[PDB]
Design an enzyme around this catalytic site. Structure first.
Site, PDB file in Angstrom:
ATOM      1  N   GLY A  26       0.752  -1.249   0.000  1.00 35.65           N
ATOM      2  CA  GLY A  26       0.000   0.000   0.000  1.00 35.65           C
ATOM      3  C   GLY A  26       0.792   1.315   0.000  1.00 35.65           C
ATOM      4  N   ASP A 132     -16.179   0.791   7.922  1.00 35.66           N
ATOM      5  CA  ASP A 132     -14.926   1.294   8.483  1.00 35.66           C
ATOM      6  C   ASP A 132     -14.949   2.820   8.594  1.00 35.66           C
ATOM      7  OD1 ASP A 132     -12.346   1.377   9.585  1.00 35.66           O
ATOM      8  OD2 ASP A 132     -11.346   1.010   7.668  1.00 35.66           O
ATOM      9  N   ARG A 136      -9.773   8.696  10.584  1.00 38.82           N
ATOM     10  CA  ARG A 136      -8.675   8.459   9.644  1.00 38.82           C
ATOM     11  C   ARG A 136      -9.177   8.271   8.214  1.00 38.82           C
ATOM     12  NH1 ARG A 136      -9.339   3.914  12.876  1.00 38.82           N
ATOM     13  NH2 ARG A 136     -10.516   2.420  11.588  1.00 38.82           N
ATOM     14  N   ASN A 137     -10.414   7.812   8.054  1.00 39.93           N
ATOM     15  CA  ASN A 137     -10.934   7.484   6.701  1.00 39.93           C
ATOM     16  C   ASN A 137     -11.792   8.643   6.189  1.00 39.93           C
ATOM     17  OD1 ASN A 137      -9.492   5.044   6.626  1.00 39.93           O
ATOM     18  ND2 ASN A 137     -11.093   4.049   7.845  1.00 39.93           N
ATOM     19  N   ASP A 150     -11.980   5.420   1.754  1.00 39.93           N
ATOM     20  CA  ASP A 150     -11.580   4.073   2.138  1.00 39.93           C
ATOM     21  C   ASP A 150     -12.768   3.128   2.225  1.00 39.93           C
ATOM     22  OD1 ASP A 150      -8.770   3.335   2.467  1.00 39.93           O
ATOM     23  OD2 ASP A 150      -8.675   5.203   3.618  1.00 39.93           O
TER      24      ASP A 150
HETATM   25  C1  LIG Z   1      -7.670   6.271  -5.239  1.00 39.48           C
HETATM   26  C2  LIG Z   1      -7.696   6.312  -4.051  1.00 39.48           C
HETATM   27  C3  LIG Z   1      -7.721   6.405  -2.532  1.00 39.48           C
HETATM   28  C4  LIG Z   1      -8.397   5.452  -1.782  1.00 39.48           C
HETATM   29  C5  LIG Z   1      -8.409   5.552  -0.397  1.00 39.48           C
HETATM   30  C6  LIG Z   1      -7.743   6.601   0.230  1.00 39.48           C
HETATM   31  C7  LIG Z   1      -7.060   7.551  -0.521  1.00 39.48           C
HETATM   32  N1  LIG Z   1      -6.356   8.637   0.154  1.00 39.48           N
HETATM   33  C8  LIG Z   1      -6.302  10.013  -0.370  1.00 39.48           C
HETATM   34  N2  LIG Z   1      -7.146  10.464  -1.301  1.00 39.48           N
HETATM   35  C9  LIG Z   1      -7.053  11.750  -1.725  1.00 39.48           C
HETATM   36  N3  LIG Z   1      -6.109  12.594  -1.246  1.00 39.48           N
HETATM   37  C10 LIG Z   1      -5.238  12.165  -0.303  1.00 39.48           C
HETATM   38  C11 LIG Z   1      -4.253  13.040   0.212  1.00 39.48           C
HETATM   39  C12 LIG Z   1      -3.363  12.582   1.186  1.00 39.48           C
HETATM   40  C13 LIG Z   1      -3.460  11.264   1.638  1.00 39.48           C
HETATM   41  C14 LIG Z   1      -4.420  10.425   1.131  1.00 39.48           C
HETATM   42  C15 LIG Z   1      -5.324  10.888   0.146  1.00 39.48           C
HETATM   43  O1  LIG Z   1      -2.594  10.735   2.590  1.00 39.48           O
HETATM   44  C16 LIG Z   1      -2.971  10.871   3.924  1.00 39.48           C
HETATM   45  C17 LIG Z   1      -1.677  10.752   4.738  1.00 39.48           C
HETATM   46  O2  LIG Z   1      -1.304  12.024   5.199  1.00 39.48           O
HETATM   47  C18 LIG Z   1      -0.661  12.843   4.269  1.00 39.48           C
HETATM   48  C19 LIG Z   1      -1.231  14.257   4.392  1.00 39.48           C
HETATM   49  O3  LIG Z   1      -0.811  14.936   3.231  1.00 39.48           O
HETATM   50  C20 LIG Z   1      -1.823  15.648   2.555  1.00 39.48           C
HETATM   51  C21 LIG Z   1      -2.426  14.775   1.440  1.00 39.48           C
HETATM   52  O4  LIG Z   1      -2.357  13.402   1.739  1.00 39.48           O
HETATM   53  C22 LIG Z   1      -7.048   7.446  -1.909  1.00 39.48           C
END
Ligand SMILES: C#Cc1cccc(Nc2ncnc3cc4c(cc23)OCCOCCOCCO4)c1
Length: 275
Positions: A26, A132, A136-137, A150
């Protein structure tokens, strides 16, 4: 007697997007997606056996369309299976709330609660159980706009967020989701405290049977705390419906300081405008 799921599964050429940085592990990366014949640039996050599961996720994300749920933009079928979604620049709400503890007013907290209830109510419409829900999600597009993500467990193990009937009889319902809604609100109202911190998950089932629940968060008036508690009723049908959580927090968001007591009160297009 269910409706046909006519969602579209968009397959993206890996040459259409440019990774730019790892965000977590992941693995999720930040990047830019440029639809080939389109003069737009789109900020994106890019995320046997394993493949089967991630495609279950892609299935669910492609099948939801609501301002408070993250929707799949497409998948890329290269050497690996990459889900491409809308970049949520401010990360997930659990981290966000911990980092800005001292800068979050009642208006934001209550508005997040409303928006999460809207997302969850939408998933209920779509006959979807998230299974879930947790801070966090939930992701932060802007401080004003969060979205649930998620769906890797959703259907048509996080013990400390789970209804008792889920810990006991692996039963899951929109009302067991309400229970998780209530633990998630507790996470926000305590600026990201760990629920049942130090209490091993094996004990959670017994604690909840004795009638224990998470304590009333300091900033919470009894009105807000009482709503949380109702999400934790043993009788699952005695818990609030998402459509009611929306209403109640809407009322409270209209006068936030009455309900939360807080010391100190080029060519880029966001995915939400790429339809
Ligand atoms: C396809 C797909 C999919 C499926 C499940 C979850 C996610 N997750 C996310 N989807 C959009 N944007 C995100 C931006 C993130 C991030 C996760 C993101 O990481 C969090 C950790 O902390 C970093 C903080 O940094 C700032 C930005 O981080 C994507």
């Amino acid at each position: 007697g269910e409706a046909p799921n006519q969602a579209l599964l968009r397959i993206l050429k890996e040459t259409e997007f440019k990774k730019i940085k790892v965000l977590g592990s992941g693995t999720v990366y930040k990047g830019l997606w440029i639809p080939e014949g389109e003069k737009v640039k789109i900020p994106v996050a890019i995320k046997p056996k394993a493949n089967k599961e991630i495609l279950d996720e892609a299935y669910v994300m492609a099948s939801v369309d609501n301002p408070h749920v993250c929707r799949l933009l497409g998948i890329c079928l290269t050497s690996t299976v990459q889900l491409i979604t809308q970049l949520m620049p401010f990360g997930c709400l659990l981290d966000y709330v911990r980092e800005h503890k001292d800068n979050i007013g009642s208006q934001y907290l209550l508005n997040w609660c409303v928006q999460i209830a809207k997302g969850m109510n939408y998933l209920e419409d779509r006959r979807l159980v998230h299974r879930d829900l947790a801070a966090r999600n939930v992701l932060v597009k802007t401080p004003q706009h969060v979205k649930i993500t998620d769906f890797g467990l959703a259907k048509l193990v996080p013990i400390k967020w789970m209804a008792l009937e889920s810990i006991l009889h692996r039963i899951y319902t929109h009302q067991s989701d309400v229970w998780s809604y209530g633990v998630t609100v507790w996470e926000l109202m305590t600026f990201g405290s760990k629920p049942y911190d130090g209490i091993p998950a094996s004990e959670i089932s017994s604690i909840l049977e004795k009638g224990e629940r998470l304590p009333q968060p300091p900033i919470c008036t009894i009105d807000v705390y009482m709503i949380m508690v109702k999400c934790w009723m043993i009788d699952a049908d005695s818990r609030p419906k998402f459509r009611e959580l929306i209403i109640e927090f809407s009322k409270m968001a209209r006068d936030p300081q009455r309900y939360l007591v807080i010391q100190g009160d080029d060519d880029v297009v966001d995915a939400d405008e790429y339809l």
